[PDB]
């Protein structure tokens, strides 16, 4: 029960939640069955429409009307948004030439520029050019404010996961909303778009914008609107709130539209029936902007126009069914659609074996429109593993496709031509961002960015201190006229050692051999200087990376490379080298194929040994700086030092050798030299963060040599490619990857062919931001450049997608 029969009179859309069992007069009361008897009557008026007409101007105030055209209307703060246009001969906001907003132009009482979030659902990024003829208001915001060509959602590209990421600056794995449908195995409860479970606060983690504001003394408008409340009402409600007295008036507001997503599901992203939903949205933006112009706020408010995700062509006939792959289809549960998630049907069966499930789903059809992963082996750029609500088995589905359990689920559980939720680098999933206001720049285009980054920015605009999030604060400073935030480099925690020659050959008993005895007054002081760092500014162009945790490590210098060697992990944390466009590839000579040499700078005790790799049949080794790319036969001996050595599965050595022998030189060709930094990553617990010495779960058999989970590389050159990588005067260009280090190549269905048909496709799939690598290594790159630090934080958030132009 709820004794809900008090009044809403004078309380229509109040900002507080009053104590039960009283009656409420806010957006959630409809959802909670808690509204006052008169709520509909008073708080949802519709009489006479939403627009003034020439025969209403200066009328008798009739309280029952939806909005007003009377003389007192501006004072009451409740006119129809076109009241000035009809009754006072003022022009629409779209019709005015935009004039730069050099300073905020706010009425008295207004301490700071308000922020209005205008969020639109399923608004595909290509709509801004393709629908530009039927969206004159939106086009003005875009062209006069600050806009990206598109904005990147988070995976899965679904509604609830994206709205709450916008709200928090968190990955879905961190905020807890990992899909529109979820099973928590500890709650033993399910979360769905339909029903009541979603109303409990235990699902929603992190701290969203409106809570962050509240706790810091900034009043917030609503971020939930009933579907039944028409969009015209939503706007007048926001405009009413802006009219309130100073100490009652919120600083941050939200408007949400269900369109164009609701139609895109029925008609597909470009159906002819899509023109009217785009017409609708542009009117609502017109109404808001005319409304702000009325109350003198259109040169004072910051507006964000933003989408949750895009929309792809998807139909029933493009459904892959699991019952065509698995005999035991009734011992699994599947979360279906544009992404697949599998768990056991019953916890009782300990016979349920994820390995057999994955084996049956791997490369079984030449056409296969999905690929199975254990969640820990998904690309790290999706950050979709670390939550108990994400099932162990995941299916990445091809764009334009679906997966289901059995055919009966499709025709009795065709009505649709659109869907979304695919991999977040897929063009059709990209969405929009426009910023318009005093605090944004004027007629400015910025590079595409991720939606995780907007939390920090909306905090700046409101003078708040952002709760801990996954954005990189400072990386979007270039969108703003003036910044609240001045970013600074983290301090180095561990300074390196610089060992000289301290050990004799005969002190080592590592089980390694090499043909290196056969070998001057000229050349001895030449290669002396290389071990002392004479060519440090050739192979290490942006400073040594900084180690941001407490450890024990050595810098080691060579003619062709320089490395950060960990005494704790017995292998380098990072290896840096520059391959110029002129450089040549050469082969490993017959006598040096088994060559591994002790390093006289590093002790036998803090060194790897050949014996452990001999003992381990499953485990061979590779090298971080590639022998193939040695600058001279004399130099090559450096590449074989035991301190350049890393553990690698034979299967992985195939991917690695082809990267080192073919791809590095080809990049150097295209990019006018490249500088590469490569290293191991240890993330056994898949939280996306480096693992400490006492979290290692795998060692090369009988050794203390830890086994990396991934291997990374960062590849940097000059954005103006007419300048060589190592003599670049301005901005830089980068691409990176995080290869999973796996004992098989089951992920690449074509792997039995030559490496040239598959390896590059694999690396493309595991593309990465420098910032992802920093989280996983505890390192900090690009310490010493000529570029501003804001420009460097942008560089670090960059992701090279290998998609063609939108
Ligand atoms: C993206 O950004 C986010 C935010 O910055 C990063 O996530 C943070 O990472 C931290 C490191 O993992 C983590 O810090 C821990 O916090 C513990 C307290 O946790 C609660 O309080 C915070 C603060 O309000 C709150 O945010 C948390 O919310 C989580 O949990 C609730 C309910 O369960 C969820 O509703 C919510 O969605 C969120 O879940 C997420 O995080 C949990 C873990 O917290 C995951 O399991 C989920 O999958 C989900 O992603 C909590 O309510 C604190 O107690 C910890 O301190 C222990 O550990 C450290 C390190 O050893 C140490 O300093 C302490 O001594 C202490 O040790 C004790 O526990 C150890 C482990 O069992 C053990 O070794 C000892 O024996 C001790 O008993 C710890 O500091 C922080 O909570 C999250 N924040 C969020 C919001 O997720 C994220 O990493 C970033 N991602 C990337 C890729 O960079
Ligand atoms: C109603 C119930 C399901 C109980 O939960 C709620 O009320 N929420 C659940 C969480 N939430 C959201 O994440 C949410 C975010 C946005 C949003 C959009 C863009 C930008 Cl730049 C920032 C944002 F914040 C818009 C609309 C929205 N819609 C909601 O519904 C609210 C409140
Ligand atoms: Ca980790
Ligand atoms: Cl889902
Ligand atoms: Zn959506
Ligand atoms: Zn949708």
From Swiss-Prot:
<dbReference type="GO" id="GO:0010634">
    <property type="term" value="P:positive regulation of epithelial cell migration"/>
</dbReference>
<feature type="binding site">
    <location>
        <position position="261"/>
    </location>
    <ligand>
        <name>1-(9Z-octadecenoyl)-sn-glycero-3-phosphate</name>
    </ligand>
</feature>
<feature type="active site" description="Nucleophile">
    <location>
        <position position="159"/>
    </location>
</feature>
<dbReference type="GO" id="GO:0016020">
    <property type="term" value="C:membrane"/>
</dbReference>
<feature type="binding site">
    <location>
        <position position="159"/>
    </location>
    <ligand>
        <name>1-tetradecanoyl-sn-glycerol 3-phosphate</name>
    </ligand>
</feature>
<feature type="binding site">
    <location>
        <position position="420"/>
    </location>
    <ligand>
        <name>1-hexadecanoyl-sn-glycero-3-phosphate</name>
    </ligand>
</feature>
<dbReference type="GO" id="GO:0047391">
    <property type="term" value="F:alkylglycerophosphoethanolamine phosphodiesterase activity"/>
</dbReference>
<dbReference type="GO" id="GO:0006955">
    <property type="term" value="P:immune response"/>
</dbReference>
<dbReference type="GO" id="GO:0030247">
    <property type="term" value="F:polysaccharide binding"/>
</dbReference>
<dbReference type="InterPro" id="IPR001604">
    <property type="entry name" value="Endo_G_ENPP1-like_dom"/>
</dbReference>
<dbReference type="InterPro" id="IPR020821">
    <property type="entry name" value="ENPP1-3/EXOG-like_nuc-like"/>
</dbReference>
<keyword id="KW-0325">Glycoprotein</keyword>
<dbReference type="GO" id="GO:0005509">
    <property type="term" value="F:calcium ion binding"/>
</dbReference>
<dbReference type="GO" id="GO:0008270">
    <property type="term" value="F:zinc ion binding"/>
</dbReference>
<feature type="region of interest" description="Required for secretion">
    <location>
        <begin position="773"/>
        <end position="794"/>
    </location>
</feature>
<dbReference type="InterPro" id="IPR020436">
    <property type="entry name" value="SMB_chordata"/>
</dbReference>
<feature type="domain" description="SMB 2">
    <location>
        <begin position="48"/>
        <end position="92"/>
    </location>
</feature>
<feature type="binding site">
    <location>
        <position position="265"/>
    </location>
    <ligand>
        <name>Zn(2+) 2</name>
    </ligand>
</feature>
<feature type="glycosylation site" description="N-linked (GlcNAc...) asparagine">
    <location>
        <position position="3"/>
    </location>
</feature>
<dbReference type="GO" id="GO:0071276">
    <property type="term" value="P:cellular response to cadmium ion"/>
</dbReference>
<feature type="binding site">
    <location>
        <position position="159"/>
    </location>
    <ligand>
        <name>Zn(2+) 1</name>
    </ligand>
</feature>
<dbReference type="Pfam" id="PF01663">
    <property type="entry name" value="Phosphodiest"/>
</dbReference>
<dbReference type="GO" id="GO:1903165">
    <property type="term" value="P:response to polycyclic arene"/>
</dbReference>
<feature type="disulfide bond">
    <location>
        <begin position="514"/>
        <end position="595"/>
    </location>
</feature>
<dbReference type="GO" id="GO:0005044">
    <property type="term" value="F:scavenger receptor activity"/>
</dbReference>
<feature type="disulfide bond">
    <location>
        <begin position="23"/>
        <end position="36"/>
    </location>
</feature>
<feature type="disulfide bond">
    <location>
        <begin position="106"/>
        <end position="300"/>
    </location>
</feature>
<feature type="binding site">
    <location>
        <position position="180"/>
    </location>
    <ligand>
        <name>1-tetradecanoyl-sn-glycerol 3-phosphate</name>
    </ligand>
</feature>
<feature type="disulfide bond">
    <location>
        <begin position="316"/>
        <end position="414"/>
    </location>
</feature>
<keyword id="KW-0442">Lipid degradation</keyword>
<dbReference type="InterPro" id="IPR044929">
    <property type="entry name" value="DNA/RNA_non-sp_Endonuclease_sf"/>
</dbReference>
<keyword id="KW-0165">Cleavage on pair of basic residues</keyword>
<dbReference type="InterPro" id="IPR002591">
    <property type="entry name" value="Phosphodiest/P_Trfase"/>
</dbReference>
<feature type="binding site">
    <location>
        <position position="180"/>
    </location>
    <ligand>
        <name>1-(9Z-octadecenoyl)-sn-glycero-3-phosphate</name>
    </ligand>
</feature>
<protein>
    <recommendedName>
        <fullName>Autotaxin</fullName>
        <ecNumber>3.1.4.39</ecNumber>
        <ecNumber>3.1.4.4</ecNumber>
    </recommendedName>
</protein>
<feature type="binding site">
    <location>
        <position position="689"/>
    </location>
    <ligand>
        <name>Ca(2+)</name>
    </ligand>
</feature>
<dbReference type="GO" id="GO:0005615">
    <property type="term" value="C:extracellular space"/>
</dbReference>
<feature type="region of interest" description="Phosphodiesterase">
    <location>
        <begin position="94"/>
        <end position="447"/>
    </location>
</feature>
<feature type="disulfide bond">
    <location>
        <begin position="8"/>
        <end position="25"/>
    </location>
</feature>
<dbReference type="GO" id="GO:0044849">
    <property type="term" value="P:estrous cycle"/>
</dbReference>
<feature type="glycosylation site" description="N-linked (GlcNAc...) asparagine">
    <location>
        <position position="348"/>
    </location>
</feature>
<feature type="disulfide bond">
    <location>
        <begin position="512"/>
        <end position="610"/>
    </location>
</feature>
């Amino acid at each position: 029960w709820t004794a809900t029969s008090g009044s809403c009179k004078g309380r229509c859309f109040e900002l507080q939640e009053v104590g039960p069992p009283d009656c409420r007069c806010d957006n959630l009361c409809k959802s909670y069955s808690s509204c006052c008897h008169d709520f509909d009557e008073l708080c949802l008026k519709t009489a006479r429409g939403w627009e003034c007409t020439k025969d209403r101007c200066g009328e008798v105030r009739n309280e029952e009307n939806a909005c007003h055209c009377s003389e007192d209307c501006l004072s009451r703060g409740d006119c129809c948004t076109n009241y000035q246009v009809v009754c006072k001969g003022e022009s629409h906001w779209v019709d005015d030439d935009c004039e730069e907003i050099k300073v905020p132009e706010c009425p008295a009482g207004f301490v700071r520029p308000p922020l209005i979030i205008f969020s639109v659902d399923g608004f595909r990024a290509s709509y801004m050019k393709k629908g530009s003829k039927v969206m004159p208001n939106i086009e003005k915001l875009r062209s006069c404010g600050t806009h990206a060509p598109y904005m990147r959602p988070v995976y899965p590209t679904k509604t609830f996961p994206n709205l709450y990421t916008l709200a928090t600056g968190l990955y879905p794995e961190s905020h807890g909303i990992v899909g529109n449908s979820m099973y928590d195995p500890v709650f033993d409860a399910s979360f769905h778009l339909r029903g009541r479970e979603k109303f409990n606060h235990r699902w929603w983690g992190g701290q969203p914008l409106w809570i962050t504001a509240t706790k810091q003394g900034v009043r917030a408008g609503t971020f939930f609107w009933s579907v039944s409340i028409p969009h015209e009402r939503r706007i007048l409600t926001i405009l009413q709130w802006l009219s309130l007295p100073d100490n009652e008036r919120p600083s941050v507001y939200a408007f949400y539209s269900e369109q164009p997503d609701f139609s895109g599901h029925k008609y597909g992203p470009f159906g002819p029936e899509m023109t009217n939903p785009l017409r609708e949205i542009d009117k609502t933006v017109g109404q808001l902007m005319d409304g702000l112009k009325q109350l003198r706020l259109h040169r004072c408010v910051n507006v964000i126009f933003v989408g949750d995700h895009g929309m792809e062509d998807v139909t029933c006939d493009r459904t892959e069914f699991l019952s065509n792959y698995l005999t035991n289809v009734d011992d699994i549960t599947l979360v279906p659609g544009t992404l697949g998630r599998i768990r056991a049907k019953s916890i009782n069966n300990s016979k349920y074996d994820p390995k057999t499930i994955i084996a049956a789903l791997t490369c079984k059809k030449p056409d296969q429109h999905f690929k199975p992963y254990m969640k820990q082996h998904l690309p790290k750029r999706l950050h979709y593993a670390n939550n108990r609500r994400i099932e162990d088995i995941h299916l990445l589905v091809d764009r334009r496709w679906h997966v289901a359990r059995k055919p009966l689920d499709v025709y009795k559980k065709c009505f649709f031509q659109g869907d979304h939720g695919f991999d977040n680098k897929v063009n059709s999933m990209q969405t929009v961002f426009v910023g318009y206001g005093p605090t944004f720049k004027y007629r400015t285009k910025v590079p595409p960015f991720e939606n995780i980054e907007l939390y920090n920015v909306m905090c700046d605009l409101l003078g708040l201190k952002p709760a801990p999030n996954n954005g990189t604060h400072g990386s979007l400073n270039h969108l703003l006229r003036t910044n609240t935030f001045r970013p600074t480099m983290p301090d180095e925690v561990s300074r390196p050692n610089y060992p000289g020659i301290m050990y004799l050959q005969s002190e080592f008993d590592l089980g390694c051999t090499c043909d290196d005895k056969v070998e001057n007054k000229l050349e001895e002081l030449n290669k002396r200087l290389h071990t002392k760092g004479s060519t440090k500014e050739r192979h290490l162009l942006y400073g040594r990376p900084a180690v941001l945790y407490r450890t024990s490590y050595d810098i080691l210098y060579h003619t062709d490379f320089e490395s950060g060697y960990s005494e704790i992990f017995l292998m380098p944390l990072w290896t840096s080298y520059t391959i110029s466009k002129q450089a040549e590839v050469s082969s490993i000579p017959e006598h040096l194929t088994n060559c591994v040499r002790p390093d006289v700078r590093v002790s036998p005790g803090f060194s790897q040994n050949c014996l452990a790799y001999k003992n381990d049949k499953q485990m061979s080794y590779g090298f971080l700086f590639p022998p193939y790319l040695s600058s001279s036969p004399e130099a090559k001996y450096d590449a074989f030092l035991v301190t350049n050595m890393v553990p690698m599965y034979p299967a992985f050595k195939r991917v690695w050798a082809y990267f080192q022998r073919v791809l590095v030189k080809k990049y150097a060709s295209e990019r006018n030299g490249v500088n590469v930094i490569s290293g191991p990553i240890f993330d056994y617990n898949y939280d996306g963060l480096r693992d400490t010495e006492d979290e290692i779960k795998q060692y090369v058999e009988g050794s203390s040599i830890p086994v990396p989970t991934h291997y990374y590389s960062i590849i940097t050159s000059c954005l103006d490619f007419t300048q060589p990588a190592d003599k670049c005067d301005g901005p830089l260009s980068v691409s990176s990857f995080i290869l999973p280090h796996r004992p098989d190549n089951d992920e690449s269905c074509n792997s039995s062919e030559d490496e040239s048909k598959w390896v590059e496709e694999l690396m493309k799939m595991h593309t990465a931001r420098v910032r992802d690598i920093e989280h996983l290594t505890g390192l900090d790159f690009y310490r010493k450049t000529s570029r501003s630090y804001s420009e460097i934080l942008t560089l670090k958030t960059y992701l090279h997608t290998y998609e063609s132009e939108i």
